[model samples]
Target: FRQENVDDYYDTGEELGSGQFAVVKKCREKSTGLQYAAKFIKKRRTKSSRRGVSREDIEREVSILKEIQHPNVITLHEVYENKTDVILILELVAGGELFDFLAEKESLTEEEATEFLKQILNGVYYLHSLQIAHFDLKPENIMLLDRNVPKPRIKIIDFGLAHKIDFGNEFKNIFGTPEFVAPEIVNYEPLGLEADMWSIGVITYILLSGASPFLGDTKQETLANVSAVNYEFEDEYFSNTSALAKDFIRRLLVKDPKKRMTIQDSLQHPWIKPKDTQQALSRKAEAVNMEKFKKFAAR
Candidate 1:
């Protein structure tokens, strides 16, 4: 069995982030002398409360993380359970979410965008290889390991709705942010890894245009647009973006999962190609000191 996960790893500092059911704290691991992010969930309350999560949902998340290990995926160091809560000690990413960064700067240049996408594709490929699906892959879950670096390496965090499956298997789970939801999901049809690529397509579109490709006033309308692939960009931005990049998104946002590009295929897309020394350096310098972060969180 895994070691007991504890809530008192570090003195709880400011709330770094929060959701309907959980809150993440900026904590320092006393043993390792490093910082970490602690995800706290009041399990019993979450199970019983209207806003709390079901046990199955909680298990799915922990199960998915336990089965996979990769550089791109956020490291789950230890899990401790108590009568009141389940404490998940995770990698403390000081730089915060990519969405926060984008908020400060609406969009990234081609070089910056490519750099971010490359790491994301790498992580996605690793995830698919393990038959795990990140139902949500928006900028909020993508975080930086270190902000001081020239190009901080991005890590995919938060697996609250993630799960494992066979490649041929399909799902009807409609559990992703509206902006990134795939067409099949909105129809309540079976979905697979292709759903992830669709989100990547949305991410790519947003990265280039600094706005959502498909927007609607309500959930129903958004779902409709998602199924219809209704989206457009300014001629100026579209014209400036490389043909390869545009085609990459086109291949991803396809209506049919069978025709959609796989994560590996997406990685191989020319648009993600390395452009220059500076960009190459940025990619190479991407680092996640997993052990250090884990020790910090576990302490």
Candidate 2:
């Protein structure tokens, strides 16, 4: 808890964006006059309070970010507060979500998708190496460092969901978005780090085909779809896609967690490998439009 007033240091400016109880504003450090995002979110009033994150959890997130020195991960700046609102100052991330980045472009080639996908896996790879399960690893959690840059740095956010898991033991928590959640999530089985790989597969599927892998008319059916892993590479959707790209998604979307590809093996895949093959694709596919993602991100 910061005792001093926030305005004493940086000037909070116009609101950048916000959620139900969260508000992010543009701010500048008085000493350097540099830009930053001041995220002021509601504090826990009571366990009874419907909405309000705990100051304890606030510190948990702060504790989480301070130790993260990853290049593609967020670094904490400072936390300033008034009362009942914990204001966290983090690096200003102006770039849109990966979905919008591709949506604005309307369409992109698998070669281009590979670049962005690799960066995401690299960030996830580091988190996995640390044994931190960033269960929330969908496109929404992935942010571009700066929008419109030819080489946009992908930074994964949502530190609140990150927690270290024991390598020798299994942990189970089923609360995840149905759209990209793993099969174990809905199957009510032991949860593990492979959950992220399932999401990566869904992300890759949509990015390449402009269609979600496991969605249904209702949320109930949606989870059932994931539980069953009932998606396919229909010719209508992936006719223009490359074989290697399909295989990359294939090994990732497996229903059995043990059978799923590891993040390390995923990194080794020829499709996302850094410099293994120059002629990456045996054949080039038609550009897939991401306009479908625009509507998909309306949550």
Candidate 3:
């Protein structure tokens, strides 16, 4: 947690990406010559500015990163702060966004989807065990370590919307991406770990068919679909999909959070159980339109 002059340790390179108030750049450590992603977050000038992120949000993200350590979660290397900016040195993940990676594939096999979901659940399980909830779990936030490898590893990133809830504590904020948001969040009901499970259900559905089941023509329509908990496996898209995988989604997308599956239960479900060898599905992979996903990710 010690703060060092960022210039003393690393030389900044090309910009990896940028957000409203933060810019992530590729950097090389001066002595070790190791690569890293350095996120430069600007200090908020005023509380009223719409573009400024609160300092509390920054601190909370840093605290959560410092507290957790998991293979499926992004690693925080160090923190550097100056008058106008706070820099977060993170492990460089060269693999691109999960959405982009999946879109590039002609078709995603059932075994592939299962493997990805397992990794996601494993990471979420770890977070739940520690009383943390990642309110935002869209595909864009999930990244692959190396897309060219035989099995690219998944890493969950972005803790800005994450929260640490104690036993019996309830979160009632209306936040998160519209399509993937849980029904409880839309209803302004107290939320718990089940909220995350709902998002996983949405992710699983998209991964299998490359379609967002609840997305509508408009934002209001999308929110309405989520609140109504109305979605279906269109025969055109899911006719060849496995029944077991659909059942897994059904168990998690329940309107009542109390009835939703826990991370442990999801891990044990038939759809997620590890097989002796990954068996390819006979059904043809669904051709998901990347344009729609790209638009959603941008939002």
Candidate 4:
């Protein structure tokens, strides 16, 4: 199956990105001229193995993708294996990393920041509805599209750590970036979708300020800060940010998972709506490279 199906379909291009266990290559379907992202992973290093991931982890990731389809979720196109590598073909997004954009500008005005958060909340809402928890949600995993247009299309990528949840069940896993990870994971307490919300709050704080709310000299320190819910903000910056935005983060950053904001509730916040398209006004994109981005990811 590996040789017959995947090797035949994937013709490697320039390296789009590289990581510990996998390398991504841009590829195109010869028959359709449609481009795609082929995430090539070393077989022994599945997502569950120590420094290596399990085949089940990979399967679970694929299973989650197969189960849900949303405009903001990066679309999975195909899954196959080669002799030594597992290849996943996914829809190419044209937007660059959100972190990159933030690095350039450092921060955004309340109106500008809200638009992007609104879109993110919409995407999160859809994912929650499907009982999917994106354990890893960060700027690097978010890509923008349709840069040529005023309101760019935002897509969430990198479901390598994602898992499906049974309704009404509690989750127990120490997952996600430490800076953004919820406190419950540290205490070994059961968690839920609210964990993701906490991460979102961290990201929102980053989007509004040039830096993180919780930062320490070391990763351990950062994690400790997260566990303690200790964060700081510049009075000038905090004062300039809108009250609604502050309240939004305040609700999301709570340590209690049950009390955290739901994705649907976050989307319905007054700051998220323009009262017109039912879409959050906070997601308007400025300058981004959509075509080049698409071509790069596909290649």
TM-score of each: 0.83, 0.88, 0.89, 0.84
A best-first ranking of the candidates according to their lDDT comes to 3, 2, 1, 4
lDDT of each: 0.73, 0.79, 0.82, 0.72
- Model 3 over residues 145-218: C-alpha lDDT tens digits? 88998888999988777888886447557568899999888878887878999999999888876678899889
C-alpha RMSD (angstroms) for model 1: 8.2
Q: Write the per-residue lDDT of candidate 2 for residues 1-299, one digit (tens) a residue.
A: 67788888998899977866688899998989898989887987787787887677677677777777787887789887776788889988778687777777756788888888888888889988877777777878788888866798988887765666676325656467898888887877767778888889988898887778788889999998888888988776787787788888999999988899999999998777635455466424654575555544452
lDDT of 4 by residue, 1-299 (tens): 24556657656687788887778888888777888888877766544546545666777888888776888789988888755676888888766876565454533556776667777887888888887888788887888865556677778888887767676546556556777778887666776677788989988887765456766779889888988899865663454555566777888898888888888778776656545543333333221223322322342
Which run of 10 residues does model 3 get worst, by summed lDDT? 276-285
lDDT score, candidate 4, position 73: 83
The all-Cα superposition gives candidate 2 an RMSD in Å to the true structure of 2.8
Please give the distance, in angstroms, between residue 282's alpha carbon in candidate 4 and its true position after superposition: 13
- Judged by whole-model lDDT over C-alpha atoms, candidate 1 comes out at 0.73
- 1-299 in candidate 1: lDDT tens per residue? 13354545565688888887788887777777777778877564544467566656667787787877787788877676665567677877777777556545533556567777888999999998888778788888888887667878899988886767675656656667887888887778877877888999988886665556776778778878898989875563454565566777889888988899999888776667645654344433212122322322342
At residue 93, what lDDT does model 2 achieve? Answer: 78
Off by over 4 Å in 1: 1-9, 44-51, 102-108, 274-299
| Whole-structure CA lDDT of model 3 | 0.82
Prediction RMSDs, each to the true structure: 8.2, 2.8, 3.4, 6.3
Error of 1 at 36 (Å): 1.6
In model 2, the Cα lDDT at residue 114 comes to: 81
Write down the lDDT that model 2 would get: 0.79
